[PDB]
């Protein structure tokens, strides 16, 4: 279950152990309904819901957007697959669900994938048309990779206010379903069926993001003393909620970064820290006040923090970072018991090229990545998965030169980089400050690491020996 290629090229980390509910009350529910209705209509000002098609689903399936992918392509080509979809949709239009599989017979597999299409048909517009994208939603970050999220926190840091602060009920589900009020009747019926029966047993990412935006809007309202204690059991003067949303809702949305259950909020002051009563009544929490962060570069978001670094020419980038033990520990884990050398080497290359794109600023990872890429045949294609995060978009899964990919991601298509001058040398690309690298787990200066770095070419040649000296290798170390 260990990746032997990564393990052999990371010997200093062999001794690193880090590597080796009651209902919300009536007033709370009315607040939730008011805020949810408001936000859905704001999100729908510039977008109209639509039914996604069989043809869109087929096009998506053919690009995986294991060997199950070949089975899925065969399924969507099968007329029997779509006849079964048509029959189950007949049930959905009556508010029932019968053949859908939510959690090995080919019939069971067809109806699991058919359930996925029915969800995509009814609710795929949320992702396909980027309803929770930051442009449309203020607080969402849908579509952004780890290479961009840090810029959002940097922008939020510029707003005045306090520090930065970092379980779906049936009532949350009812509020999510309010989007169906913007649909035609057929579409609304299809969406209500998918919402109800998926819950009863990615679209849930968009709906999770919506619910979290509502929750954070409510927390700000409590923090700013618009909502009072008695409003938990009976909302007095509900129009005050509408007035606050009108006056302040968009400003507060733009003070948020929300990705599913992950969120950062920049409130207008630090009353936010103890605004926990509606949060708790909604079952979303303990009464300890939240601890805020004064430094935006330390705020955790989507398992990372984000650091502003400068190229030699003075242009800045904002990079994702996490403790190095987590990155090396994951790369050393192989999920396949088959333990094929080629599949293992190709997965190691995937991790190395990920590090070159996103974690190049870690001294240990740039060296270890170049060692891995020098030890795996240059023609072998990266395979496997290196992260479960929706914000790791997989640009490293390629045989293209990673400096060209780096340039595309950080320069060419980076909207925060107006100067599009290409970077022609890896030596122009910065590391973290040494103290910051050390803070996040770097072994620089540790004698076993120095020895590993000094003899890394010997270790690379040993891996090549094991994989096969007649393969073709490139030298990324010199
Ligand atoms: Zn069904
Ligand atoms: Zn870090």
Residue numbers in the entry: 321 to 340, 364 to 408, 417 to 454, 471 to 533, 542 to 576, 606 to 689, 695 to 887
What does the paper say about this structure?
Similar to other flaviviruses, ZIKV NS5 RdRp adopts a ‘right-hand'-shaped structure, with the three main domains named as fingers (residues 321–488 and 542–608), palm (residues 489–541 and 609–714) and the thumb (residues 715–903). The active site of the ZIKV NS5 RdRp is located above the palm and is surrounded by loops protruding from both thumb and palm domains, likely to be involved in the stabilization of the RNA molecules during the extension. The priming loop, responsible for the allosteric positioning of the 3′ terminus of the RNA template at the active site is also present in ZIKV NS5 RdRp (residues V785–D810).
We recombinantly expressed and purified ZIKV NS5 RdRp (residues 306–903) of the MR/766 strain. The structure of the NS5 RdRp was refined to 1.9 Å resolution, with final Rwork and Rfree of 17 and 20%, respectively. Due to disorder, parts of loops 1 (residues 340–363), 3 (residues 408–417), 4 (residues 454–471), 5 (residues 533–542) and 6 (residues 576–606) are also missing in the model. Similar to DENV, the ZIKV NS5 RdRp binds to two Zn+2 ions, one at the finger (G439, H443, C448 and C451) and the other at the thumb (H714, C730, C849) domain. The priming loop of the ZIKV adopts a closed conformation when compared with the equivalent region in DENV2 (ligand bound) and DENV3 (ligand free and ligand bound), providing a smaller binding pocket. ZIKV RdRp priming loop has three glycine residues (G793, G801 and G803, respectively), which are replaced with bulkier amino-acid residues in DENV2 and DENV3 (S791, A799 and H801, respectively). These substitutions may provide additional flexibility to the ZIKV priming loop, thereby allowing it to adopt a closed conformation, similar to the ones adopted by JEV and WNV. While electrostatic surface of DENV2 and DENV3 are positively charged, the ZIKV priming loop binding site presents more neutral surface charge.
